[PDB]
Each structure stands twice: as structure tokens, then as C-alpha cells.
Design a protein around this nucleic acid. Structure first.
Lengths: 77, 223, 149, 117
RNA sequence: UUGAGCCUUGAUGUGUAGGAUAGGUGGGAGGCUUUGAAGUGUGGACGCCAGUCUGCAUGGAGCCGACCUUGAAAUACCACCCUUUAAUGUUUGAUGUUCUAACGUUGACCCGUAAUCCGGGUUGCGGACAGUGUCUGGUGGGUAGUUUGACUGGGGCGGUC
RNA sequence: CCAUAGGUUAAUGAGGCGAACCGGGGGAACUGAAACAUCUAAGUACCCCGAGGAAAAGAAAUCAACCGAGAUUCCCCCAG
RNA sequence: CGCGGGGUGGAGCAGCCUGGUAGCUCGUCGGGCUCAUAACCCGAAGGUCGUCGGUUCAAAUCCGGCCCCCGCAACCA
């Protein structure tokens, strides 16, 4: 799965559809990249998987209000 | 504005791709004035008429209630002792058959005319030279009035003129580049009223559109 | 890109107003340096207050002021040189102390090399001019030493 | 757009055409004329009757460059190889040098042996 | 470095008769040019051969109005409007320029690790390429779903519907 | 180097099982349209993930119509 | 069985499908270059563009039969 590790964006069910009367499945897949961040509480760099719409959130909110509260129990990152 | 040694040094403060906030443009209007004394601004009324049709051609003026600055030289048409208190109120010249000998030659040693109804019987001999100079008084305008001394004092607020020949919009002076933009709006409101009282019969479709003021390398902004 | 400044920067800043910058420049400098953020005008007072404790604690590991930024304008020259290969090439990078030093005082590899390069140490044995690294607010160049005499 | 008043010219005369160029020392062709420009068919194009009426048609091709002093280069065997030069001198221009640069055959590939009759 | 569009600005502008190339047009005596006017032409465009601009020979703060007199209308000073056209600017495609930082290594090395993958480090060489996505012009019987007229003491061509 | 990947030790949580129900995911063809693709059939069939004693929903940037409602689900109806 | 076309100087092929309207080459009958013929060049002679009615300003041309033909197909149980 192409998961945006910084937001939980996953693939979704959906149809292609065009100007045609016959309708066929698509299932929307994300574009998937990596990005590296600094954690001032652990004084180390970490690498996370990122995607469109999701990578737009973290840069806007700030890592000290996103990545600094992202662990649900630890997730070994 | 003309490109000069004292103008280059303010042209370097502005970019050909950049526009300004309404409140910053009313400062740029004075920056762009290169003279050591405060310059004057001309404003366009946004119209509304065919640029060359004579049955849509506009020509006239209106007198302001308080004015924006400099005063006008006033002449009074009245009889007898009634002129002396008008000379004390704001008249520089008196309408007499002695002065009518200069008026019939087209020579107006004055900027505004006020008339008393029984002396208007003399002005009706001269209306054909006062007419094409904007000077002819008329009862619908209130420039024919018995209280002439108070009315010449009312004239010192000055007047704003408007006419076309080849353009559908009309350009005219209204005051100094240092005049209050909120009071400019009030005098432009009085101008737009006089322009609706001066509306030609055949002015079909849209007439009064939105009005703005323009600067070099800042574009027009709403008044 | 519109951002608001959190610290006094000589090139840009508007009090209580966003300023234009490139997002790429911001993401390499002004953002990771803590000096700017996109919007958050409503929240930057609480962020500034959340740095106040962090910098008060940072003074426990480093509170010292720099004395070297005042000294740079002497254009003081390098006294160390690399030992060169038979072919007229160097062994490149291995440690930050066998390079650009002028005082021979260090006993271990330094955290800040005296010169700034995208890739450490040049393998050419000729005379070349490099940018002297003290702090990202004062600038100078110097030539490399190839003689040590 | 000031006149240059100095330069070079190149003359070519083959057995089938006279082609004249007003040139620059950098190897540019500034204006040209061809003897087939007079509408003449075959080896007519190599005679003085054709080449002598290409010269002022070539001076017209540089009418915005402005000419006065010219160094001339000449190649090829064609009879028109000098009337086109005198016609250009007679147009009010002054020849700084004349040099012949006609090739001497070197390798030459294959000749007619075996020549058309 | 420049193709394309667009902004920006200057030269304009006359006949006829007379000083006088009044472009239009709305105001009008103290205001303006120093990156600018003169000379008046050598020479370039245009030409009423005057003049202005490109740029000189070249200088370098002025100037202008009265008297005189043309005309709907004036000739300092200051708005507004324009044809044609180029350069500066600008948006946006090309051509190539250096150089790392998105991206990449079916390069090399050290360590995890007596591991050809992976992870961390090291040191080279590539690259604003690839890989990929939103939207989309076009293709695609390779694959797949479906449609595919009737009469005639027989059928097909023909005829009939 | 310090560190950390890596290594070790102690503790908690999960693991497998259990009838039917239940949220989410993958997703037809037949059938009807007396013929077929949209439409109907069907989010059925079958397969997958995951979980509770129920699952699911909720008290409004919802629903009305100038009257007002004031959570959701289940039932008869509204309404062929 | 028909279908679509054709109906041309002697032969072979144009034009047609836009009525203001019979043509080219080989031939046939003579001129020119010739000693002589062919080529070439200039001239002449020729077709009821099937047949009878109809429609019209008019019919090789359109409209209905009759009449002679070319080409395509003349085997399905």
C-alpha cells in the first residue's frame, strides 16, 4: 500500500468514467515519495513516505504540531 | 508626466508591473508631482455617451458648495446701492452699461456672474456672449437671485467645468494632489449630480458608470 | 510564497504582515532555522512561547557567544597543507582538521570546517580560492596552502 | 546604416553561368547577381553580353551597405570573367586589388575520355 | 541569446496665402528643460528638401510673450487622445550554460554481517533527466460485451415490401 | 568519540478457539427491457479483512418554510 | 432469366452527363519536301450518333415501346 505516513492517506474505490455509457472501475492510487525530517525531542533525522494532499498539510501546519504528536504508540520510527 | 532629471529620481521608485492599494495610490499621486509647489489633479467621469454625436455632446459647469481651494473673481448684476454690500461680500466688479462696453467685446474681467432679476433685464442684451463662455446666469441654476451679496459669497467656493468634442469620457481639474480623498469623493458626488442635471435628452442606455483616479505605474483606483 | 518572520533578518521582514519569499529557499534556510513560517499569525505567539523554554534549556549545553565573526576581516591565511600523491592528486576528505587550519591547536576532527564546499576537500594540487566559513552573516575568500612553509 | 565604403568582391565564371558576389572579409555574401538572371539559356550566361549586365545588378544588391573600395577575387574559365569587373568599375567603384584564384586541377576525379560530340 | 504576444515611450501631424508644419483638444503668465536646445549638414530613414529622429561635427541653461498679424481655434506652462514602429521592460516557448540540493546509480567502499536484497555511514559519477501522478487530444479486434429484416406451392440473381 | 542501528534481560498487549448476527474491502453473470449496451438485476452471489455482546447511526455550517422542527434506529404509513 | 450501359463517318475510340454543339487517329482522294514512297505539313470526301410516337424555342441529347449489342452472373436441393 502507498500510504502517506504523515496523514494516513490510502488508495480509494472509484470509477474512471468518460463520455461513454459503459462504466468501468479505476481504484484511485496515490503518487508515493520519501521525505526526511528532524525531531528536536529525539535529536535525529527520520525518513517517512509522503504523497499529494498529505505532503501539503505537514509543511503548512509545521512539524512541531504534526510529527511531534504523530506516534499512536511508537510505530518504530 | 514628462521624463526629466527631477522625474527619473521618482520613476526609480515604481515598477511597470506593480499596482498599489487605494490608500497608497493617493500618496503616489503626490510623489509623481515633481514641482516644489503642490500640483493639481484632473479626473475622468466614466460615461456613457457617444464620443462624437452632437445630440449626446455635453458642455457646462457647476458651482461648488464649499470648494477645494483657490477662489474665483465674481461680477454682480444689480442696481443702485445694492451693489456696495455685494462688493463687501465677494464682488470685484459691478454689471453696468459702462462695463457692458467691455463684455460685448468678449472680454470678461471676471470668472463667475450672479444677477438680480430686475438687472437681468440688462444681461438679456449680452446673453449671446456670456452663453459660449459658461457665464450666463439662469433661474433653474439659482444664479438669478435677489440676494446677490450672499450669492457672490456662495460663488467663492469656485466651479468645475465639463465638456467633450471627440471622446465619450470627460476630463477636468478638481484640486491639488494633496487634497483629502474623502472630501474629493464629496465634490465628485456634487459633480455627478450636476452631470445628471446636465444629461442630454438622447443619452440612451447606460450613463453614469463607476469613477476612479489614475497614477503612472499604479493604475486607476476607485473614489 | 507568503511567510511571516519570527526573527530579525536584514534582508526581509514586515511587522505583523507576510512577506514574499521562495518556498525552496524558505525550506532550506528560514523555515529549518526557525526564522519564518507560512501564516499561523493566530498561533505564532504560542509557538514563540514554546521556543522560550527550549532555548532557556539550550543554554545548558551551549550559551557561549562567538568571538570569531569580529576577526574575519583580517583575511588570515591557512598554515596546513595536504601531503600529495606521486601523480599530483590528493586523497580527498577523511577528517576536518588536516584542512584549512591556521593554528594547529585541535586534537580531534572539528564540527565546522574553516571553508564551505557542497562536497568536502578538492583533489587538485593547484592554487584555488575557497569561501571561508565562520557564520552565515559574514563573508570572505582565501586561497589554499600547498607549501606549509 | 552608415556606408562601409571598403570591402571585397568574388567573381565566378563557369562554362554555363557567371555568378558575382559582393562579400565581406569574414566570408559573408552581402549581395549577388547571376547571368541566368537576364533570362538567357545555356552558355549565353558565360558571355560578356550576359556578364556585363550582372555588375550593376550586383551593386544594387548592396544599396544599403554602401561601397567604394573593393578587393577582387576571380575564379573559373568563363569569357565574362573581366567585363563584369570593368562594368563594376564604370559604376563609380574603385578596385583596391585584383587577384586570380582559379583552381589548378588536383586529383580531378574522372575526366571525359570519352567526351561528348 | 532570442521566436511569439503584451505593456511602455518618441517621431509624427504642413498643403493653398502671410510671419508661421497651430495634429487633435480642455485649461492657461511666470514656469520649465542639464540623459538637453542650438548647427545644418557630412551621412541614414522619411520629405513640401524644410525638419525631426538614429548618431555626430558639437555645447551645455535656457527661453517665451508685447509691437505685428493669421485663423473656428495660438505660438511660455500644464492635462487628455492616436495611427505606424523599435527598443527597454514583461509573460511565455526555444537554443545552450554551470552545478547540486527534487531525483538516480544494473558505480565503488566501510559497518550492521563469516548477507549478492535491505538499512546506516563513506567516496565518486549522473540530474532538473528518469519514475510517477491530475486532466486530456489520439491510437488500440491484441482482449471483451452486443447488434446483425421479410414474401416466394424450395434456394440464389432479379422482382415484391 | 559521545551516540544510535544492531545485541541482551525483565514486563504488558496480541496470537488459537467458539453458533448466528455485524462494520469495511474485492465484486459478477443470469434476469427484465417479449431484442440490447444505458437502465433493471445488485452492491445480490461468492471471496477477503476485522470486530463487539451487539455491530452501525446521533442531538446540526441538519431539517423546514415565515409555521416551526430540534438526535439516531425499528414499525405502520406518507406513496405507487 | 436478368442488371447496368451502349446505339459515332469504313475500322477503332473521343464528346455527352452544361442543347445553342458531330470529333480524332488509322484509312480513302489530292496537294508540299522527292527521283520515289513513308514520316511530317496543307487541303478535301464521309456519319440519318437504331426505330416510331411524344414533350418543345429544340431532340444524336429528354419521355414510352419496339429493335440490335457489350460487359457481369448464368453450377444453390
Amino acid at each position: 500500500s502507498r500510504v502517506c505516513q504523515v496523514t494516513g492517506k490510502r488508495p480509494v474505490t472509484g470509477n474512471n468514467r468518460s463520455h461513454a455509457l459503459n462504466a468501468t472501475k479505476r481504484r484511485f492510487l496515490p503518487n508515493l515519495h520519501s521525505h526526511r525530517f528532524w525531531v528536536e525531542s529525539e535529536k535525529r533525522f527520520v525518513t517517512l513516505r509522503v504523497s499529494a494532499k498529505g505532503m501539503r498539510v505537514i509543511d503548512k501546519k509545521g512539524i512541531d504540531t504534526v510529527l511531534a504528536e504523530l506516534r499512536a504508540r511508537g510505530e518504530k520510527y | 508626466a514628462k521624463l526629466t532629471k527631477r522625474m527619473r529620481v521618482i520613476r526609480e521608485k515604481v515598477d511597470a508591473t506593480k499596482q498599489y492599494d487605494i490608500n497608497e495610490a493617493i500618496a503616489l499621486l503626490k510623489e509623481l508631482a515633481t514641482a516644489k509647489f503642490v500640483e493639481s489633479v484632473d479626473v475622468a467621469v466614466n460615461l456613457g455617451i457617444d464620443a462624437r454625436k452632437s445630440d449626446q455632446n455635453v458642455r457646462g459647469a457647476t458651482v461648488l458648495p464649499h470648494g477645494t481651494g483657490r477662489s474665483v473673481r465674481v461680477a454682480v448684476f444689480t442696481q443702485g446701492a445694492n451693489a456696495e454690500a455685494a462688493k463687501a461680500a465677494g464682488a470685484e466688479l459691478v454689471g453696468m452699461e459702462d462695463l457692458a462696453d467691455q463684455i460685448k467685446k468678449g472680454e470678461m474681467n471676471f470668472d463667475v456672474v450672479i444677477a438680480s432679476p430686475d438687472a437681468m433685464r440688462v444681461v438679456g442684451q449680452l446673453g449671446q456672449v456670456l452663453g459660449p463662455r459658461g457665464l450666463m446666469p439662469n433661474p433653474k441654476v439659482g444664479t438669478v437671485t435677489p440676494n446677490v451679496a450672499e450669492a457672490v459669497k456662495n460663488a467663492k467656493a469656485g466651479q468645475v467645468r465639463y465638456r467633450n468634442d471627440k471622446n465619450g469620457i470627460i476630463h477636468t481639474t478638481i484640486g491639488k494632489v494633496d487634497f483629502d480623498a474623502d472630501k474629493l469623493k464629496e465634490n465628485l458626488e456634487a459633480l455627478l449630480v450636476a452631470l445628471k442635471k446636465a444629461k442630454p435628452t438622447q443619452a440612451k442606455g447606460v450613463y453614469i458608470k463607476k469613477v476612479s483616479i489614475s497614477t503612472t505605474m499604479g493604475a486607476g483606483v476607485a473614489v | 510564497m507568503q511567510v511571516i518572520l519570527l526573527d530579525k533578518v536584514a534582508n526581509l521582514g514586515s511587522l505583523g504582515d507576510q512577506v514574499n519569499v521562495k518556498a525552496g529557499y524558505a525550506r532550506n534556510f528560514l523555515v529549518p532555522q526557525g526564522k519564518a513560517v507560512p501564516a499561523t499569525k493566530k498561533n505564532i505567539e504560542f509557538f514563540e512561547a514554546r521556543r522560550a523554554e527550549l532555548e532557556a534549556k539550550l543554554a545548558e549545553v551551549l550559551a557561549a557567544a562567538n568571538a570569531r565573526a569580529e576577526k574575519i576581516n583580517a583575511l588570515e591565511t591557512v598554515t596546513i597543507a595536504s601531503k600529495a600523491g606521486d601523480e599530483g592528486k590528493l586523497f580527498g576528505s577523511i577528517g576536518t582538521r588536516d584542512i584549512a587550519d591556521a593554528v594547529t591547536a585541535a586534537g580531534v576532527e572539528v564540527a565546522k570546517s574553516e571553508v564551505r564546499l557542497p562536497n568536502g576537500v578538492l583533489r587538485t594540487t593547484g592554487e584555488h580560492e575557497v569561501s571561508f566559513q565562520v557564520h552565515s552573516e559574514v563573508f570572505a575568500k582565501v586561497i589554499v596552502n600547498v607549501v606549509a612553509e | 546604416r552608415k556606408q562601409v565604403s571598403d570591402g571585397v568582391a568574388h567573381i565566378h565564371a563557369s562554362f554555363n553561368n557567371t555568378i558575382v558576389t559582393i562579400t565581406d572579409r569574414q566570408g559573408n555574401a552581402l549581395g549577388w547577381a547571376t547571368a541566368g538572371g537576364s533570362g538567357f539559356r545555356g552558355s549565353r550566361k558565360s558571355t560578356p553580353f550576359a556578364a556585363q549586365v550582372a555588375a550593376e545588378r550586383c551593386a544594387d544588391a548592396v544599396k544599403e551597405y554602401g561601397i567604394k573600395n573593393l578587393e577582387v577575387m576571380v575564379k573559373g574559365p568563363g569569357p565574362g570573367r573581366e567585363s563584369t569587373i570593368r562594368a563594376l568599375n564604370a559604376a563609380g567603384f574603385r578596385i583596391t586589388n585584383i587577384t586570380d584564384v582559379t583552381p589548378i586541377p588536383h586529383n580531378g576525379c574522372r575526366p571525359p575520355k570519352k567526351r561528348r560530340v
